[PDB]
Amino acid sequence: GLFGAIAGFIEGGWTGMIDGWYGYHHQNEQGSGYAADQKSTQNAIDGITSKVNSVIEKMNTQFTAVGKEFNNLERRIENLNKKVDDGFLDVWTYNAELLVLLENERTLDFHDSNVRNLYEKVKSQLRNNAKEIGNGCFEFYHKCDDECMESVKNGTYDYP
């Protein structure tokens, strides 16, 4: 919600858009329907994948036995051990909990940014050839056939 698009000025999502994360709708006299934007979806899929790999795999791991056995005259060194185990417990629990919380915020905001950026890429091409009717929609002043919609999606629009 940091970029005001997802759940913001674009009020809802499309369950109808099954082939990707971000995309377009469009309505013609030749029909209508959904289409994902491959470039940004694939970029996001790629970025988020690197993110998950980083969190999962940058974790270094040493072969360790952990358990220790001390007799009833070694209580002090038994408690040192407990202190170590408990210390790492506290460190890992906290930084794990907060790592997920923080990365989760960042991830959702990342998606929000991609939607706002995509919306702006369209707005920028169309300029005053369409009117921003709100909710992420542009209404063309001219007549926009299938080849022309394809150009807006391509990023090829070309018209003052």
Partner: protein, 322 residues
């Protein structure tokens, strides 16, 4: 004609936590927390040693209740169950026991051999050393790997036997020292009231005296037995001299220590599955960074954590708003 910009939604009910907001429904997520286990005790490439009704002490010494066991070849860790009591049957102290347990927890080669044959090595001495404390099928017996040497009718001559290590591995030698309850029992067993036991090698020298002292009965025995061990280096030579109280080595073990490991206590079933990470309740199929299954593990483990949920968003905020 219209063109709209917009984003995906679906029937997902996955829910994640963010820093600003809780319980946020998202379109896609992954779990980062391993929160379940195998139910089984597995291998680490290699299988674990199961002691069952015995424990390390009972196993090494040859408690008479551990005959139906001997399965040593090589192992990645030791398993003891809640039924693991038959160990030291004659009451006494097993010296540096926790230490031995740790160093024996993963062995890559392990073979039992007859260090000092009962028959040939002790002329001039006895071999009726049994006890109701260490009994098999009702009759009094004794450890299978130790020999209770006693006096041959009225005379316990200074005994002296040696062993040179030629196995090309470390040899683990165990022995005992008997502590009678009274000064007269010291007599009827080993004659010589002034008695001593002496063990010696390149890096081991100790003398023991009989600590004759009144004490309570444990397993019907007022006497005590102290168990000792050492790791005899290749080519080295351990030497035993005694005038009484020596519970001699009968069998020793030749071994190759890998790297250390641990002992797990668990009644979970042993299987042939393979794992990189083992916990007392079961193995972790783990490639995830964190787990909350159990703090005490053996292997390459996800970090133990006290969380109950660590779901990480990959998708966007889901608003199916149809």
């Amino acid at each position: 004609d219209t063109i709209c910009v917009g984003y995906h939604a679906n029937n997902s009910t996955d829910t994640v936590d963010t820093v600003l907001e809780k319980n946020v429904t998202v379109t896609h997520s992954v779990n980062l927390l391993e929160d379940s286990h195998n139910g089984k005790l597995c291998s680490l490439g290699i299988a674990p040693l199961q002691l069952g009704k015995c424990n390390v002490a009972g196993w090494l010494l040859g408690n008479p209740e551990c005959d139906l066991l001997l399965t040593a070849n090589s192992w990645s860790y030791i398993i003891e169950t809640s039924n693991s009591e038959n160990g030291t049957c004659y009451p006494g102290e097993f010296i540096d026991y926790e230490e031995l347990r740790e160093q024996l927890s993963s062995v890559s080669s392990f073979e039992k051999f007859e260090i000092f044959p009962k028959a040939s090595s002790w002329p001039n001495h006895e071999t009726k050393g049994v006890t109701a404390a260490c009994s098999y099928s009702g009759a009094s017996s004794f450890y299978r790997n130790l020999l209770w040497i006693t006096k041959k009718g009225t005379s316990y001559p200074k005994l002296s036997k040696s062993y040179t290590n030629n196995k090309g591995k470390e040899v683990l030698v165990l022995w005992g020292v008997h502590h009678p309850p009274s000064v007269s029992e010291q007599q009827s067993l080993y004659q010589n009231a002034d008695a001593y036991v002496s063990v010696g090698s390149s890096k081991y020298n100790r003398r023991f005296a009989p600590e004759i002292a009144a004490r309570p009965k444990v397993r019907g025995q007022a006497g005590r037995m102290n168990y000792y061990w050492t790791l005899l280096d290749q080519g080295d030579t351990i030497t035993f001299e005694a005038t009484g109280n020596l519970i001699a080595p009968w069998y020793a073990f030749a071994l190759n220590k890998g790297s250390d490991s641990g002992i797990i206590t668990s009644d979970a079933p042993v299987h042939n599955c393979d794992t990189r990470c083992q916990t007392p309740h079961g193995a972790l199929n783990s490639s995830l960074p964190f787990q909350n299954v159990h703090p005490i593990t053996i292997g390459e483990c996800p970090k133990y954590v006290k969380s109950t949920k660590l779901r990480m968003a990959t998708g966007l905020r889901n608003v199916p708003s149809r």
